[PDB]
Write a protein that binds this DNA or RNA. Structure first.
Ligand SMILES: [Mg+2]
Ligand SMILES: [Mg+2]
Ligand SMILES: [Mg+2]
Ligand SMILES: [Mg+2]
Ligand SMILES: [Mg+2]
Ligand SMILES: [Mg+2]
Ligand SMILES: [Mg+2]
Ligand SMILES: [Mg+2]
Ligand SMILES: [Mg+2]
Ligand SMILES: [Mg+2]
Ligand SMILES: [Mg+2]
Ligand SMILES: [Mg+2]
Ligand SMILES: [Mg+2]
Ligand SMILES: [Mg+2]
Ligand SMILES: [Mg+2]
Ligand SMILES: [Mg+2]
Ligand SMILES: [Mg+2]
Ligand SMILES: [Mg+2]
Ligand SMILES: [Mg+2]
Ligand SMILES: [Mg+2]
Ligand SMILES: [Mg+2]
Ligand SMILES: [Mg+2]
Ligand SMILES: [Mg+2]
Ligand SMILES: [Mg+2]
Ligand SMILES: [Mg+2]
Ligand SMILES: [Mg+2]
Ligand SMILES: [Mg+2]
Ligand SMILES: [Mg+2]
Ligand SMILES: [Mg+2]
Ligand SMILES: [Mg+2]
Ligand SMILES: [Mg+2]
Ligand SMILES: [Mg+2]
Ligand SMILES: [Mg+2]
Ligand SMILES: [Mg+2]
Ligand SMILES: [Mg+2]
Ligand SMILES: [Mg+2]
Ligand SMILES: [Mg+2]
Ligand SMILES: [Mg+2]
Ligand SMILES: [Mg+2]
Ligand SMILES: [Mg+2]
Ligand SMILES: [Mg+2]
Ligand SMILES: [Mg+2]
Ligand SMILES: [Mg+2]
Ligand SMILES: [Mg+2]
Ligand SMILES: [Mg+2]
Ligand SMILES: [Mg+2]
Ligand SMILES: [Mg+2]
Ligand SMILES: [Mg+2]
Ligand SMILES: [Mg+2]
Ligand SMILES: [Mg+2]
Ligand SMILES: [Mg+2]
Ligand SMILES: [Mg+2]
Ligand SMILES: [Mg+2]
Ligand SMILES: [Mg+2]
Ligand SMILES: [Mg+2]
Ligand SMILES: [Mg+2]
Ligand SMILES: [Mg+2]
Ligand SMILES: [Mg+2]
Ligand SMILES: [Mg+2]
Ligand SMILES: [Mg+2]
Ligand SMILES: [Mg+2]
Ligand SMILES: [Mg+2]
Ligand SMILES: [Mg+2]
Ligand SMILES: [Mg+2]
Ligand SMILES: [Mg+2]
Ligand SMILES: [Mg+2]
Ligand SMILES: [Mg+2]
Ligand SMILES: [Mg+2]
Ligand SMILES: [Mg+2]
Ligand SMILES: [Mg+2]
Ligand SMILES: [Mg+2]
Ligand SMILES: [Mg+2]
Ligand SMILES: [Mg+2]
Ligand SMILES: [Mg+2]
Ligand SMILES: [Mg+2]
Ligand SMILES: [Mg+2]
Ligand SMILES: [Mg+2]
Ligand SMILES: [Mg+2]
Ligand SMILES: [Mg+2]
Ligand SMILES: [Mg+2]
Ligand SMILES: [Mg+2]
Ligand SMILES: [Mg+2]
Ligand SMILES: [Mg+2]
Ligand SMILES: [Mg+2]
Ligand SMILES: [Mg+2]
Ligand SMILES: [Mg+2]
Ligand SMILES: [Mg+2]
Ligand SMILES: [Mg+2]
Ligand SMILES: [Mg+2]
Ligand SMILES: [Mg+2]
Ligand SMILES: [Mg+2]
Ligand SMILES: [Mg+2]
Ligand SMILES: [Mg+2]
Ligand SMILES: [Mg+2]
Ligand SMILES: [Mg+2]
Ligand SMILES: [Mg+2]
Ligand SMILES: [Mg+2]
Ligand SMILES: [Mg+2]
Ligand SMILES: [Mg+2]
Ligand SMILES: [Mg+2]
Ligand SMILES: [Mg+2]
Ligand SMILES: [Mg+2]
Ligand SMILES: [Mg+2]
Ligand SMILES: [Mg+2]
Ligand SMILES: [Mg+2]
Ligand SMILES: [Mg+2]
Ligand SMILES: [Mg+2]
Ligand SMILES: [Mg+2]
Ligand SMILES: [Mg+2]
Ligand SMILES: [Mg+2]
Ligand SMILES: [Mg+2]
Ligand SMILES: [Mg+2]
Ligand SMILES: [Mg+2]
Ligand SMILES: [Mg+2]
Ligand SMILES: [Mg+2]
Ligand SMILES: [Mg+2]
Ligand SMILES: [Mg+2]
Ligand SMILES: [Mg+2]
Ligand SMILES: [Mg+2]
Ligand SMILES: [Mg+2]
Ligand SMILES: [Mg+2]
Ligand SMILES: [Mg+2]
Ligand SMILES: [Mg+2]
Ligand SMILES: [Mg+2]
Ligand SMILES: [Mg+2]
Ligand SMILES: [Mg+2]
Ligand SMILES: [Mg+2]
Ligand SMILES: [Mg+2]
Ligand SMILES: [Mg+2]
Ligand SMILES: [Mg+2]
Ligand SMILES: [Mg+2]
Ligand SMILES: [Mg+2]
Ligand SMILES: [Mg+2]
Ligand SMILES: [Mg+2]
Ligand SMILES: [Mg+2]
Ligand SMILES: [Mg+2]
Ligand SMILES: [Mg+2]
Ligand SMILES: [Mg+2]
Ligand SMILES: [Mg+2]
Ligand SMILES: [Mg+2]
Ligand SMILES: [Mg+2]
Ligand SMILES: [Mg+2]
Ligand SMILES: [Mg+2]
Ligand SMILES: [Mg+2]
Ligand SMILES: [Mg+2]
Ligand SMILES: [Mg+2]
Ligand SMILES: [Mg+2]
Lengths: 96, 82, 99, 122
RNA sequence: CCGAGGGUAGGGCCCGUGACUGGGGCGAAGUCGUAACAAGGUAGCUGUACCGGAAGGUGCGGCUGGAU
RNA sequence: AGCGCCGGCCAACUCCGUGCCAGCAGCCGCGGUAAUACGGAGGGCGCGAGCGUUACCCGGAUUCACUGGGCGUAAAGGGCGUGUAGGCGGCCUGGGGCGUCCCAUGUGAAAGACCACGGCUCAACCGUGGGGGAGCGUGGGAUACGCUCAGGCUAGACGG
RNA sequence: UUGGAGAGUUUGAUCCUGGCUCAGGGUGAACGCUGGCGGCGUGCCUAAGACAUGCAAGUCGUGCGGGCCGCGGGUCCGUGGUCAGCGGCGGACGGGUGAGUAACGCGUGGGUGACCUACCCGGAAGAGGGGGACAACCCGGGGAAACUCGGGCUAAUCCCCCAUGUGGACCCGCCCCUUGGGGUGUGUCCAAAGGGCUUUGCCCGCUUCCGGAUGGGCCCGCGUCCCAUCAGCUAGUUGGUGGGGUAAUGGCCCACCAAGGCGACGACGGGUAGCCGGUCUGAGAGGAUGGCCGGCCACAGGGGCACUGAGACACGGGCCCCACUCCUACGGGAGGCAGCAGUUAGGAAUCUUCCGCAAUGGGCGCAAGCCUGACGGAGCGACGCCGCUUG
RNA sequence: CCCUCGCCAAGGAACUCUGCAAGUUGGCCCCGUAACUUCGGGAGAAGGGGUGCUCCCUGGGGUGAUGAGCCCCGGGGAGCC
């Protein structure tokens, strides 16, 4: 009528919180840089875009993101920003 | 991990093992990767143990893990002799 | 190896895609006679350079679309409208086969 | 305020879905049934293979009315439907479950089983 | 937004069942006649049509798998 | 120590009882006062901790016929043309080598199956070793036949 | 060339045609009569109907802080045990069932320059300094129970920030290649955890990276039942562009653009069926079958869903809806045997609420060891085969 | 009290010879639509969705001139009560 399955469920709800938290934060700053880049605003884009990449690879330390998902997400971010800043330029910082 | 152990064959009260390399997650008598010898714990026959020592050392080298009483039998065949 | 097939392009009405009819022969498993069967593969044509009636080779490939698992490999022959017509005549005959 | 011709939802799992009152069993000439009153009804709609079927003449107790019912404390209560639970002559439910809330008046009129089976008593 | 399902409405398929009705198979110890097998007492069979308690008849055309 | 059976198929016969009754029956068939066919008995046949029965699968069924069948009268030629797809196709030469043939090679798990040895007193059962194969992947080879591409031909077909 | 038998029955008789019938072998069988023993197998093919009770997954104090008892002894300390708690790892294996599925589900041969893989192994480098939370515990309020809610403190292999960058991740350029494979240049981004002994040395762990091995996902050619008295089917439909999503390809998902895709070589629809190694039969060809054992698939009362995680859309984990059942103190709560036994129902019919972890195997653990209805065995049934007796 | 009219709790044809009367429904656009059929129909079958206003983008037509203006017929977004 009981188990450590209960323990495992409690743990999953705490790990649940943290994964969402990081993933939201990543999604926010990603689109944010992209929005800036759109009207670029090069220095500000890259500044935020530097912060997104950090939170990404940081997510891939643990269970939140698989390394390839992190790689994928960084790729699209940087790909998007550069292509967006290409309407006007000029890239004021790194990278790269 | 991939392991070297004893899959029971034979019949009731007539135990006959094939010392075998298989994934640990397999059922005991399930599909195995390779057979590297037999073992007859009752010694009903002259050679109640055989071990391809060559092949066994390979699996050991490549990361396989013997069970305790497999490593016993593997010892008797001198796979660990330096 | 990736499977390589030869056949005729019987449709190019699609953007960057052609339809390649492929034929194969084999002895009937029980009655022994050699019989023909065919099959249509959707082929990737990124250049849209392949025309109706072209005999081509297609090679097994990573999925391009649902149903497209082959790229066109190379041209083999051209102007085989004679073959294309046998495909079309049969489809045409099907209206006669209803009620 | 249920009377002959009134359709009622059946708030149990007997298999009846809708019943039509054909008499209120309260004396020689009661005009209306309210909550806690028993009716005789015809089964007008029923799901396949239920305990009761279409055409059957059953008894039921009214557990919900769209006409508000007044209580001595000066409050009142009213529901969105007119609902009944089908019973036997012991005033026992013929089904195993009752759905939706029921009026507390049922308790005082001696429909204990039904009141306890209900998800809510209001 | 999608969404288990619930609700309203209208279709399709299949199964069981139905007052009654159609013919069929078997039974056989009955009633009626005897259509076919002989030229079977009107040679037979046939598609169709019309008709008769019934087997069947007749018309039109066909076949011989028709006796003399 | 039991169960089935003893007309023919199909191995095993007599007496009584019954008298188209009671009953038997897988098929053909048994029973109407001398029944190896019903019921019992004696005897016999066949199996034996089993024997029979029902059900179902393959066989006998070349009775869906690839191996391995048919269509005048036995069941079976479309009422007859015309023609679409398809199936099939004359003589000679060359290219290709698709079918097809050959060699090499990878794959074809274990169990089971077959041969040998061995272990439980034998066996069943179980262990150990041995030999394959189709099929498909790959590489090399062959070109008669079938296919395909090319060029001739006139014997089929068509035309004057 | 190790392999091939037929008979009865249409007639007065004949030959032929043709159907019916029999002798053979087989079974997860059942029924009758009968019934001594033993071994090895084997036993709900029906209702994937419904289930009382126990058990079928836990382990680690050598990750951490405590509560209780206890042993040693000076409230403190060690320590042993116990109990939950926090934190790991397992719980995705093993076990059951065959409903669904005519499908890339399975078989077979291939592809992945379109991918993942905890533990294990090999090789490369590394563990510098800060900060924080939540249970336990305490204190309250609320219950019949399930249990619950609130405030307050506290540790860690729990979480976070900074550094370090061996290296990896990503954008852009270049070379090699040729689908997204390897290499390199600027920038940008990312590491970590400690514990235990016999203590300037070890063992167990932790970190990033290459590889190995194992296990997988996806895709493809061919093979996979009956009805044509099912003949036409199709709007995410077929293709494109761009995004989203994934470990990764793809209409997988979305937005728009185009008008395509499939079918007499049987689409669509209906019926039946999990598939294979094999099994039974047969001279072979073929026919029949897929239970027991092995492999793969699918399901976990009906259905949807995601979370955690290397891996699940998870049988004995979570959420929701439905059906059904039960407990209740009548306010409310609980459950999922197609795990092992066992009950009931249905049926012609199918088993013990047994023993043990001794072996084999699996999880956790440095190890002792703990758990293991996997398993090894015992029980019942002439169910099957084999051996044996009644001389 | 009569006429013509408006509303009504719960019920909803229990009224009556009969739903008589009165409700319901109701325009347009879109989706969709059965038996049966003389192949026309049945059909507005049935059933259902939309409907105002504001801003932004845009497609054709008429009159001009091919343009502005005027007038007509559309489409796609985002909003407000
Ligand atoms: Mg735990
Ligand atoms: Mg936000
Ligand atoms: Mg990660
Ligand atoms: Mg594409
Ligand atoms: Mg209700
Ligand atoms: Mg009725
Ligand atoms: Mg819906
Ligand atoms: Mg629905
Ligand atoms: Mg609902
Ligand atoms: Mg009748
Ligand atoms: Mg006559
Ligand atoms: Mg006559
Ligand atoms: Mg005559
Ligand atoms: Mg006539
Ligand atoms: Mg008449
Ligand atoms: Mg008369
Ligand atoms: Mg006349
Ligand atoms: Mg005449
Ligand atoms: Mg004539
Ligand atoms: Mg016999
Ligand atoms: Mg005789
Ligand atoms: Mg015999
Ligand atoms: Mg004889
Ligand atoms: Mg008598
Ligand atoms: Mg007899
Ligand atoms: Mg006589
Ligand atoms: Mg006599
Ligand atoms: Mg006899
Ligand atoms: Mg006799
Ligand atoms: Mg015997
Ligand atoms: Mg047979
Ligand atoms: Mg045959
Ligand atoms: Mg033949
Ligand atoms: Mg014949
Ligand atoms: Mg002929
Ligand atoms: Mg004839
Ligand atoms: Mg003719
Ligand atoms: Mg002709
Ligand atoms: Mg032709
Ligand atoms: Mg030809
Ligand atoms: Mg020829
Ligand atoms: Mg040639
Ligand atoms: Mg040649
Ligand atoms: Mg060839
Ligand atoms: Mg081979
Ligand atoms: Mg084998
Ligand atoms: Mg021996
Ligand atoms: Mg052979
Ligand atoms: Mg070859
Ligand atoms: Mg020629
Ligand atoms: Mg000539
Ligand atoms: Mg001529
Ligand atoms: Mg031979
Ligand atoms: Mg024979
Ligand atoms: Mg006879
Ligand atoms: Mg005759
Ligand atoms: Mg005779
Ligand atoms: Mg015969
Ligand atoms: Mg037999
Ligand atoms: Mg018996
Ligand atoms: Mg008995
Ligand atoms: Mg024993
Ligand atoms: Mg036994
Ligand atoms: Mg059952
Ligand atoms: Mg079952
Ligand atoms: Mg049921
Ligand atoms: Mg039941
Ligand atoms: Mg236990
Ligand atoms: Mg302990
Ligand atoms: Mg603990
Ligand atoms: Mg886990
Ligand atoms: Mg499992
Ligand atoms: Mg399993
Ligand atoms: Mg088992
Ligand atoms: Mg079982
Ligand atoms: Mg199944
Ligand atoms: Mg189907
Ligand atoms: Mg395949
Ligand atoms: Mg296929
Ligand atoms: Mg494969
Ligand atoms: Mg894990
Ligand atoms: Mg702290
Ligand atoms: Mg850093
Ligand atoms: Mg540790
Ligand atoms: Mg795309
Ligand atoms: Mg995944
Ligand atoms: Mg799709
Ligand atoms: Mg769209
Ligand atoms: Mg369009
Ligand atoms: Mg085809
Ligand atoms: Mg067909
Ligand atoms: Mg079905
Ligand atoms: Mg099934
Ligand atoms: Mg034969
Ligand atoms: Mg089957
Ligand atoms: Mg079976
Ligand atoms: Mg199995
Ligand atoms: Mg399901
Ligand atoms: Mg479920
Ligand atoms: Mg169940
Ligand atoms: Mg469920
Ligand atoms: Mg996750
Ligand atoms: Mg699953
Ligand atoms: Mg369970
Ligand atoms: Mg579980
Ligand atoms: Mg669950
Ligand atoms: Mg309870
Ligand atoms: Mg209780
Ligand atoms: Mg209480
Ligand atoms: Mg609750
Ligand atoms: Mg329980
Ligand atoms: Mg059970
Ligand atoms: Mg029973
Ligand atoms: Mg019973
Ligand atoms: Mg049982
Ligand atoms: Mg058992
Ligand atoms: Mg053990
Ligand atoms: Mg162990
Ligand atoms: Mg371990
Ligand atoms: Mg120690
Ligand atoms: Mg336990
Ligand atoms: Mg046990
Ligand atoms: Mg066992
Ligand atoms: Mg026995
Ligand atoms: Mg007026
Ligand atoms: Mg009113
Ligand atoms: Mg009202
Ligand atoms: Mg009404
Ligand atoms: Mg109403
Ligand atoms: Mg009335
Ligand atoms: Mg009246
Ligand atoms: Mg009327
Ligand atoms: Mg009116
Ligand atoms: Mg009106
Ligand atoms: Mg109006
Ligand atoms: Mg009106
Ligand atoms: Mg209708
Ligand atoms: Mg009408
Ligand atoms: Mg019409
Ligand atoms: Mg309308
Ligand atoms: Mg109408
Ligand atoms: Mg409307
Ligand atoms: Mg609007
Ligand atoms: Mg207006
Ligand atoms: Mg307004
Ligand atoms: Mg004018
Ligand atoms: Mg104008």
């Amino acid at each position: 009528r009981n188990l450590s399955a209960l323990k495992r469920h409690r743990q999953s709800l705490k790990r649940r919180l943290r994964n969402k938290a990081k993933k939201s934060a990543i999604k926010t700053l990603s689109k944010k840089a992209i929005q800036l880049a759109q009207e670029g605003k090069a220095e500000e884009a890259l500044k935020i875009m530097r912060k997104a990449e950090s939170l990404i690879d940081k997510a891939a330390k643990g269970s939140t993101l698989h390394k390839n998902a992190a790689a994928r997400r960084k790729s699209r971010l940087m790909r998007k920003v550069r292509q967006l800043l290409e309407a006007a330029g000029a890239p004021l910082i790194g990278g790269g | 991990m991939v392991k070297i152990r004893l899959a029971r064959f034979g019949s009731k009260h007539n135990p006959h093992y094939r010392i075998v390399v298989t994934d640990a997650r397999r059922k005991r008598d399930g599909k195995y990767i390779e057979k590297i010898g037999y073992y007859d714990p009752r010694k009903t026959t002259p050679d109640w143990l055989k071990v391809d020592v060559e092949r066994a050392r390979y699996w050991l080298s490549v990361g396989a893990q013997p069970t305790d009483t497999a490593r016993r039998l593997l010892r008797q065949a001198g796979v660990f002799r330096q | 190896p990736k499977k390589v097939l030869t056949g005729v392009v019987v449709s190019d009405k699609m953007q960057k895609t052609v339809t390649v009819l492929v034929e194969r022969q084999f002895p009937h498993p029980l009655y022994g006679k050699v019989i023909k069967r065919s099959k249509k593969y959707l082929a990737h044509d990124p250049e849209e350079k392949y025309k109706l009636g072209d005999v081509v080779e297609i090679i097994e490939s990573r999925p391009i679309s649902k149903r497209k698992r082959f790229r066109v490999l190379r041209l083999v022959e051209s102007g085989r409208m004679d073959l294309v017509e046998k495909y079309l005549i049969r489809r045409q005959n099907y209206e006669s086969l209803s009620k | 305020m249920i009377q002959p011709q009134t359709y009622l939802e059946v708030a149990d799992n007997t298999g009846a879905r809708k019943i039509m009152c054909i008499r209120v069993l309260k004396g020689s000439n009661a005009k209306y049934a309210t909550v806690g009153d028993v009716i005789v009804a015809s089964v007008k709609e029923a799901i396949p293979r239920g305990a009761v079927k279409e055409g059957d003449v059953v008894k039921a107790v009214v557990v919900r009315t769209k006409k508000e019912i007044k209580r001595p404390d000066g409050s009142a209560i009213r529901f969105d439907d007119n609902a009944a639970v089908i019973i036997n002559n012991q005033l026992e439910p013929r089904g195993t479950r009752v759905f939706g809330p029921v009026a507390r008046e049922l308790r005082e009129k001696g429909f204990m089983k039904i009141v306890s089976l209900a998800p809510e008593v209001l």
